[PDB]
């Protein structure tokens, strides 16, 4: 049968033009009194999925 998308991953990433995966950031849920102004400001900015993580997860998002 067809391979199945990992739905949580599909809800957590977006494919860029070059094939990378844009992701959002951990530590952005609560407990903001314990993180510095700079920490929160910079955690606001999205990142990419690292190469080493991509090696592991790429098949989960092959249709994405």
């Amino acid at each position: 049968p067809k391979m199945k998308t990992h739905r949580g991953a599909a809800k957590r990433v977006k494919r860029t033009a070059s094939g990378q995966l844009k992701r959002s950031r951990a530590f952005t849920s609560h407990l903001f009194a314990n993180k510095s102004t700079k920490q929160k400001r910079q955690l606001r900015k999205a990142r990419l999925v690292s190469k080493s993580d991509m090696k592991r997860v790429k098949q989960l998002l092959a249709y994405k």
Binding site: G8, K11, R12, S24, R25, A26, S29, R56, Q59
Partner: protein, 145 residues
């Protein structure tokens, strides 16, 4: 070519590797699996994305966004693609589809301003980029939504 002299193209075919057929092959015995552990077992190996109990990447990262039920997406045509029609032509969605510039219309035709228009045309599309409309008008043509 003859049925008794068939020959595939060079490099088109390669004999498959057969494991567990003796030591000289280099894939005998453990058949390239190494020694023992989960990964050596028939049907062995963990789920893709499993990190042996470390919280996986796609659970430590958060979800983002939503999908718009009424999302619209347009079939895009650039000026460089319009460059193939004869000056004076009335380019319409039907003409784009017949000419093969547009294959799937999606929510309709939007003209975008990439490349250079070199011809006077009357372009009908559901939407236009500001730059695309300016180029169409400046080349002496007309545009209409």
């Amino acid at each position: 070519m003859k049925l008794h002299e068939l020959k595939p193209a060079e490099g088109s075919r390669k004999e498959r590797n057969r494991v567990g057929r003796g030591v000289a092959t280099g894939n005998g015995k453990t058949s390239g699996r190494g020694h023992k552990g989960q990964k050596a077992r028939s049907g062995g190996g963990v789920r893709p994305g499993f990190e042996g109990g470390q919280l996986p990447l796609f659970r430590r990262l958060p979800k983002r966004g939503f999908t718009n039920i009424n999302r619209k997406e347009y079939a895009i045509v650039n000026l460089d693609q319009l460059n193939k029609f004869e000056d004076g032509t009335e380019v319409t969605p039907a003409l784009l589809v017949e000419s093969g510039v547009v294959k799937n219309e999606k929510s309709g035709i939007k003209i975008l301003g990439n490349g250079s228009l070199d011809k006077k045309l009357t372009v009908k599309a559901h939407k236009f980029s500001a730059s695309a409309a300016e180029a169409i008008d400046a080349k002496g043509g007309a545009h209409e939504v």
